Amino acid sequence: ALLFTPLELGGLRLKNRLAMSPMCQYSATLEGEVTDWHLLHYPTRALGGVGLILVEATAVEPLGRISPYDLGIWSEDHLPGLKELARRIREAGAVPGIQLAHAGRKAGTARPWEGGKPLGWRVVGPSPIPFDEGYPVPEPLDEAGMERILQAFVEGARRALRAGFQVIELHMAHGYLLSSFLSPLSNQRTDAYGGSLENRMRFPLQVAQAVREVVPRELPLFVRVSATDWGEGGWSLEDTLAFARRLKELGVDLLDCSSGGVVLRVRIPLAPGFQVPFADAVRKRVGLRTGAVGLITTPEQAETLLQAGSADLVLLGRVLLRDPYFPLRAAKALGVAPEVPPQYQRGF
Amino acid sequence: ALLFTPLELGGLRLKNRLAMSPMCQYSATLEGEVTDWHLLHYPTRALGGVGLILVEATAVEPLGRISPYDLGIWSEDHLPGLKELARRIREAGAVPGIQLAHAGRKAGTARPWEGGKPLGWRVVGPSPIPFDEGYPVPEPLDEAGMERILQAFVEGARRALRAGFQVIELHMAHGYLLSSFLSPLSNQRTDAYGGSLENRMRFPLQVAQAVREVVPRELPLFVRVSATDWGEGGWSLEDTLAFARRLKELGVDLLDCSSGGVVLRVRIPLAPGFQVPFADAVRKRVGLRTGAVGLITTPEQAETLLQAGSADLVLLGRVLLRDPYFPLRAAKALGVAPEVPPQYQRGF
Ligand SMILES: Cc1cc2nc3c(=O)[nH]c(=O)nc-3n(C[C@H](O)[C@H](O)[C@H](O)COP(=O)(O)O)c2cc1C
Ligand SMILES: Cc1cc2nc3c(=O)[nH]c(=O)nc-3n(C[C@H](O)[C@H](O)[C@H](O)COP(=O)(O)O)c2cc1C
Ligand SMILES: O=Cc1ccc(O)cc1
Ligand SMILES: O=Cc1ccc(O)cc1
């Protein structure tokens, strides 16, 4: 089974092709600290059998947070907690990765279960266009503000490596900051950072290159993207192919192919594996390795898309929230001897 | 659905009828201390939705351990650990229970995944018959040793309450000490503690009375029994009914109905629900509350044995090792809304 054949990326080898997708837990302290919630939540899935865990979106500056309880990585005082987190993940069998994030014009909303309303922070973005009815109007970054954010990703990456994380993902998807620079739905700038495809890719590619610089080649660098925003006149799969080419030229290791999030009022044809065609096109047409994500819930489904050459890595989100030992069941269903803790062998 | 209706036990409410059955982890320190393993293993199932967790067999004296790495409760220094386990379990949503134990003539074996061989301890028993070939001949207890063992159970019961457990279960099943006193297969005593059914019940019922005395009446005392030994001439269902009657008279609140274990070479008719008939017989003929356990893996199975009045409580073992969030899924299966952690809401 390809699902449980090791994968080479950078200079490391994942034990299998299943990854835990980044998933915001809104359970950090107001200072962005790791809490007991993360220390239970993540190593459970590591024991569960994924080769890699990508820790949820972690804000590279305070105003880059989604909620006031996001993980943050903007301070060296985040190190002890992040270190302990990576350590407990590796102890339970998985490679610890982390997604570095900046929430752009969508910064500052309550936790989903606290209503999730905007908190009205002073949020930044490409253009002064609110995300939707009732969001604050983003402040448009100038070149100085972009350099400061770019430097926060760089130090965030340095900090993640020092914490012992081995895979870094840059969040350039879902209408957060770097996503919103790519899409012409959110980015209507008339300077050298909007209009043309190159102008819109500029800042995101600068971040990728600046982070590639401080992440040694043996350590894989992912970039997650919305391969389409699903809007008319929006960012399309073809734009994604152009972007992947540039990323591949910068030495980026894998493109984690998501979609949507840039604006709210589009129709998104949800179905199992609906974003798989995006991982498949990039992979086959650009030669950049891809991660597939979106309604992947079945071992046979994961296997099949790998057998098809659609992706190199299968990322799982919601199924690992409800079924955190999924990957041990998966192995068994694909005729593979699952990696069970000896304490649990009588159960499998 | 009855599976998800509260169960009232004296002063105590279990929010549902699912309980995690006791399952030795063999992952304590040599001194019987709770470790990081228990702190991860147990709260996981608690978040998984179960109303009661019974912590694995916890030896009341060192010689009463199965392995060198069982939990123990023979010392005041066991309390910080035990107290933190219960606390984490409670915090994740379950009532914390604990199984108090003495391995008796099956005491002192290596961890299963290290060959499970006898270790040469001075194990005790009602009579000098070794468990099986390879196994030591136990020392028959005298009146001094029975009284010491009794007081260990009482003080273990007191310590457990101090650590914040609310359900106490006395392990009198599976060929361990109290169970071996019941069965004439292993109890061939010729004093007031062997021979007749009255004599064999004698030490076990002393232990129960004595523990009953120190557990506040608002808190449930459980006893687990092998309802048969599957052995010719052995302890039968009939015997269990007699014993059950006596326990009910004592103020025992529930019989947790297991079977077998007394000797190695017996034919046990394994099947889904195979021990359900014993929980059913005791409940309906004795009027004593029961817990069903044994190859229960399905929500519809769990609901049904309850609808039939077969048991009051459903205990899950192995299915919770490989599927820790079974109870959340069992809810949706039975048309009830899962009690999901809000971090997990979008996954359900
Ligand atoms: C509660 C929740 C939190 C999420 N947090 C993030 C985030 O941290 N970063 C990100 O790129 N995607 C995030 N996502 C998207 C998932 O990582 C995943 O791409 C998406 O849910 C589709 O995959 P799935 O169907 O397996 O869940 C989140 C989704 C959910 C359900
Ligand atoms: C690894 C393991 C450890 C167990 N430890 C105990 C023990 O602590 N005390 C006990 O009474 N039963 C113990 N059991 C038996 C279970 O608690 C349960 O009664 C039995 O496995 C049948 O239930 P199940 O089919 O749901 O697993 C253990 C079983 C296993 C698999
Ligand atoms: O919690 C929802 C969420 C979705 C996508 C993200 O990138 C981050 C958060
Ligand atoms: O480890 C297996 C085990 C089974 C039943 C018990 O009662 C105790 C331990």
Cα A314 to Cα B232: distance, rounded to the nearest angstrom: 55
Dig out the tokens for A9 from the structure: 């990326």
What does the alpha-carbon distance between residue B56 and residue A273 come to, in Å, rounded to a whole number? 42
How many other CB atoms are there within 10 angstroms of residue A337's CB atom? Answer: 9
Strand partners, B59: B72, B101
Six-digit token string for A242: 């152009």
- Going B13 to B19 to B24 to B28, the CA torsion angle's sign is negative
Rg (CA), chain B: 19
The boundaries of the domain holding residue B290 are 1-348
Where are the strands (E) in B109-236, listed by range?
A: 124-125, 139-140, 167-172, 221-226
Task: Find the B72 Cα to ligand 4 centroid distance in Å.
Answer: 15
Residue A46 main-chain phi, psi, to 5 deg: -60, -50
Nearest C-alpha neighbor of A103 from the set A172, A165, A151: A172
C-alpha distance from residue A144 to each of A61, A149, A150, A211, B174 (Å):
15, 9, 10, 18, 72
DSSP B253: -
Cβ of B57 less than 6 Å from ligand 2? yes
What experimental approach yielded this model?
Answer: X-ray
A322/B345 touch (CB, cutoff 8 Å), yes or no: no
B325 by DSSP, 3-state: which? coil
Taking the C-alpha atoms of residue B125 and residue B97, their distance in angstroms, rounded to an integer, is: 27
Question: How far apart are the C-alpha atoms of A184 and B24, rounded to whole Å?
Answer: 59
Residue A65 tokens, joined: 């947070």
How far is it between the farthest Cα atoms of chain B? 64
Ligand nearest to the CA of A315: 1
Amino acid in the structure at residue B294: G
HSE (CB half, 13 Å, CA atoms) of A318? 12
Q: Which residue has the tokens 């999030």?
A: A261
* Structure tokens that stand for B63 in this block: 């010689």
Question: CB of B185 within 8 A of CB of B263?
Answer: yes
- Across the interface, whether the CB atoms of B322 and A37 are under 8 A apart is answered no
Instruction: Tell me which residue has tokens 């392995």.
Output: B67
Q: Which residue has the tokens 């709260």?
A: B43
User: What type of residue is B114?
Assistant: E
Task: Determine the Cα–Cα distance for residues B36 and A40; give it in Å rounded to an integer.
Answer: 11
Which of A23, A53, A290 has the most ligand 1 atoms within 8 A of CB, as the residue to mutate? A23
Chain B residues inside the 8 Å CB shell of A43? 40
Q: Which of A21, A25, A38, A44 to mutate to test the interface with B (most CBs of B within 10 A)?
A: A44
Measured distance CA(B168)–CA(B159) in Å, rounded: 11
Total number of residues shown for chain A: 348
Distances (CA, A) of A272 to A265, A315, B110, B261: 21, 13, 47, 47
- Token readout for B246 is 């006596």
The tokens of B179 are what? 């169970």
Nearest residue CA, atom 7 of ligand 4? Answer: B174
Is B317 annotated among the ligand-binding residues? yes
Cα–Cα nearest to A251, from A210, A197, A192: A210
For chain B, how many structural domains are there in total?
A: 1
Do B50 and B18 form a contact (C-beta atoms < 8 A)? yes
Is A319 within 8 Å of chain B by CB? Answer: yes
Q: Using CA atoms, how far apart are residues A43 and A92, in angstroms rounded to an integer?
A: 6
What is the token pair recorded at B44? 């996981």
- Judge whether B325 is closer than 8 Å to chain A, CB to CB: yes
Alpha-carbon torsion angle A92, A93, A99, A100, nearest 10: 70
Bridge partner residues of A9 (DSSP):
A12
Three-class SS of chain A: CHHHCCEEECCEEECCCEEECCCCCCCCCCCCCCCHHHHHHHHHHHHHCCCEEEEEEEECCHHHCCCCCCEECCCHHHHHHHHHHHHHHHHCCCEEEEEEECCHHHCCECCHHHCCCECCCCCEECCCCCCCCCCCCCEECCHHHHHHHHHHHHHHHHHHHHCCCCEEEEEECCCCHHHHHHCCCCCCCCCCCCCCHHHHHHHHHHHHHHHHHHCCCCCCEEEEEECCCCCCCCCCHHHHHHHHHHHHHCCCCEEEEECCCCCCCCCCCCCCCCCHHHHHHHHHHHCCEEEECCCCCCHHHHHHHHHCCCCCEEEECCHHHHCCCHHHHHHHHCCCCCCCCHHHHHHC
Q: Is the CB of A57 under 6 A from ligand 1?
A: yes
Phi (first) and psi of residue B316, to 5 degrees: -115, 130
Give the domain CATH number at A114: 3.20.20.70
Extract the tokens encoding B199: 């004599």
User: How far is Cα A124 from Cα B2, in angstroms, rounded to an integer?
Assistant: 52
Kindly state the helix (H) or strand (E) to which residue B78 belongs, with its residue range: none
